[PDB]
Amino acid sequence: NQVAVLYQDVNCTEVNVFQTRAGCLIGAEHVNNSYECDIPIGAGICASYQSIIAYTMSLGAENSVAYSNNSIAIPTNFTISVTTEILPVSMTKTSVDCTMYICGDSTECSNLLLQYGSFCTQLNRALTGIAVEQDKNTQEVFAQVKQIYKTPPIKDFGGFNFSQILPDPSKPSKRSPIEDLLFNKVT
Amino acid sequence: LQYGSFCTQLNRALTGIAVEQDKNTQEVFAQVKQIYKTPPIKDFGGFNF
Amino acid sequence: MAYRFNGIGVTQNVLYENQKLIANQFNSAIGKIQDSLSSTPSALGKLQDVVNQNAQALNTLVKQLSSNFGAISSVLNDILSRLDPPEAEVQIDRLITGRLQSLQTYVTQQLIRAAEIRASANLAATKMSECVLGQSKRVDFCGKGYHLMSFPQSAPHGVVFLHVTYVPAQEKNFTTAPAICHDGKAHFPREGVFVSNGTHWFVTQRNFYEPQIITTDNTFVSGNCDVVIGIVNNTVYDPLQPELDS
Amino acid sequence: NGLTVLPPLLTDEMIAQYTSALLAGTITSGWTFGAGPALQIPFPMQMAYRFNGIGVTQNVLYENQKLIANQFNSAIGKIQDSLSSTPSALGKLQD
Amino acid sequence: LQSLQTYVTQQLIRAAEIRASANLAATKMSECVLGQSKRVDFCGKGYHL
Incomplete structure (x- = not known):
């Protein structure tokens, strides 16, 4: 429950007191060591909970390659690596009735609105364009094959196991375990 | 205060821009986590850097 | 593969020659993917960011209906049933202008966010074409390392790519030369590199250590031993020589 | 007027x-450090x-190592001179 | 309020443009500095070294 306070663009003499280029920092204790950034303060200054400390951040470790005019390094083994990448594809399709929002069910308000011309039609057209764009996005990402392919019933691929990404027949959703976890983790 | 929450919207948009700038710089320049150094003697077969 | x-x-x-080890490494890596997804909550923050931004925009739009914008009240029914048309017209004009301005701001921000989402979806379609339907040579486009393959998974309003790459490991130092001198001729490797462990000279492929005997089948000759800087003397074996020897 | 600038x-x-x-x-290492x-x-x-x-x-x-190195060095020197001598080189950042 | 809203909308448009430029720069740093590119005219005129 400990906190520190930063006052921006203020000198420390008009308000564990530290004067940075971002402002005046109260509640943090300044150290001469350098770590990776945890909470960015600014101008190269970061803060961390170790009490609360403020430090200049390090860019990384130091490494010097043993360069020579006749030396080489060759790998003798390898590693297989698997990594993830998440990308958003679409938004939710939302429609707004201009007259209902702006006037409700009153008629006098609508008669007065008719003096503003064609604003509501413009707004409706813009939202409709967004709504069709979303479906276009999903088509362009996912419908890249015109044949539905299935995997053979005997899963003999030379020792490689794909059960965590292939559909689960037990579930009613016919989703893979990883897809189940992904759909459960987003609220 | 009778106009509602316009000012909060404007501040939120500007804060989003300010965060995006630092994200841009990180994505361009911070592509290595090791700091490499050249050898003290610069003999690269005739190439001058 | x-x-x-x-x-x-x-x-x-x-x-x-390493099929079982590679299969085991692949299986362990997929298992770790599942564990990491199950144990880390902030992995899917991008989709959650999109949802949160849209929801808070709608909440702000609905909340704006409680403002009076300089009129007597924010309720149309009360202001109509409390006043005559001559002044109700002016007050309703105030309300109408305020609500129209709020609606226009909402639509403008939605258009800008839609443009950003469209750029992201174009990138995802390019990745589905070039990492899942092929093998890519571009650096860091389909993961960190040398790209082997990729697998797609679907997520709410999004896509997840599992990139499988090759990473070198356990490197070792050797002495190297640009060419070999033999019989007053200069020899270069067809597809590898000349290496020396201190005593003997071999030729390896460049990404995996597998030394061979230097013969005339894995080298080609060009010029004499006078021009190249750093050439080394060593023997180049001829595979056809022992055949006619007997 | 309520305007302020934040540092990067x-x-x-x-x-x-x-x-x-x-x-x-x-x-010192070519393209290898970018993949491992x-x-x-x-x-x-x-x-x-x-x-x-x-x-x-x-x-x-x-067989042409010295010529290639000389061409490289001359090209880098001309880059430096051209930047030093032409003002409209950095127009995009200024814009 | 109108003046402030105009300023903020213009800033949002410009920020989108700058973000696109920075994404291009990040792709170039990955593919021309950390590797050798086969794409024509992506890392200069000629055959990229």
Whole structure:
């Protein structure tokens, strides 16, 4: 429950007191060591909970390659690596009735609105364009094959196991375990 | 205060821009986590850097 | 998978002679993917960011209906049933202008966010074409390392790519030379590199250590031993020589 | 009037340090440090690999090494002079 | 309020443009500095070394 306070663009003499280029920092204790950034303060200054400390951040470790005019390094083994990448594809399709929002069910308000011309039609057209764009996005990402392919019933691929990404027949959703976890983790 | 929450919207948009700038710089320049150094003697077969 | 090892510059025998180890590494990596997804909450923050931004925009739009914008009240029914048309017209004009301005701001921000989402979806379509339907040579486009393959998974309003790559490991130092001098001729490797462990000279492929005897089948000759800087003397074996010897 | 400017998180000296690390990595180890551990290699051999990349044999580089190095050095010097002598070079950042 | 809203909308448009430029720069740093590119005219005129 400990906190520190930063006052921006203020000198420390008009308000564990530290004067940075971002402002005046109260509640943090300044150290001469350098770590990776945890909470960015600014101008190269970061803060961390170790009490609360403020430090200049390090860019990384130091490494010097043993360069020579006749030396080489060759790998003798390898590693297989698997990594993830998440990308958003679409938004939710939302429609707004201009007259209902702006006037409700009153008629006098609508008669007065008719003096503003064609604003509501413009707004409706813009939202409709967004709504069709979303479906276009999903088509362009996912419908890249015109044949539905299935995997053979005997899963003999030379020792490689794909059960965590292939559909689960037990579930009613016919989703893979990883897809189940992904759909459960987003609220 | 009778106009509602316009000012909060404007501040939120500007804060989003300010965060995006630092994200841009990180994505361009911070592509290595090791700091490499050249050898003290610069003999690269005739190439001058 | 042997074809894909060829695609990154490694021979097929390297895959066929290590098939079980590679399969086990692949299976362990997929298992770790599942564990990491199950144990880390902030992994899917981008989709959650999109949802949160849209929801808070709608909440702000609905909340704006409680403002009076300089009129007597924010309720149309009360202001109509409390006043005559001559002044109700002016007050309703105030309300109408305020609500129209709020609606226009909402629509403008929605258009800008839609443009950003469209750029992201174009990138995802390019990745589905070039990492899932092929093997990519571009650096860091389909993961960190040398790209082998990729697998897609679907997520709410999004896509997840599992990139499988090759990473070198356990490197070792050797002495190297640009060419070999033999019989007053200069020899260069067809597809590898000359290496020396201190005593003997071999030729390896460049991404995996597998030394061979230097013969006339894995080298080609060009010029004499006078021009190249750093050439080394060593013998180049002739595979046809012992054949006619007997 | 309520206007203020926030400082960037990375200072100019830290961006310069990042670029110097990238230069040192590519000069001492080629493209290997971008895909795993950095593996040293002599620079003329790396340039021979890069000639192989565009469809030219290695002996072409090993037999013209001094000429190629001189051409490279002259090109870099001309880059420096051209930047120093033309004002409209950096128009985009100024815009 | 009108003046402030105009300023903020213009800033949002410009920020989108700058973000696109920075994404291009990040792709170039990955593919021309950390590797050798086969794409025509992506890392200069000629055959990229």
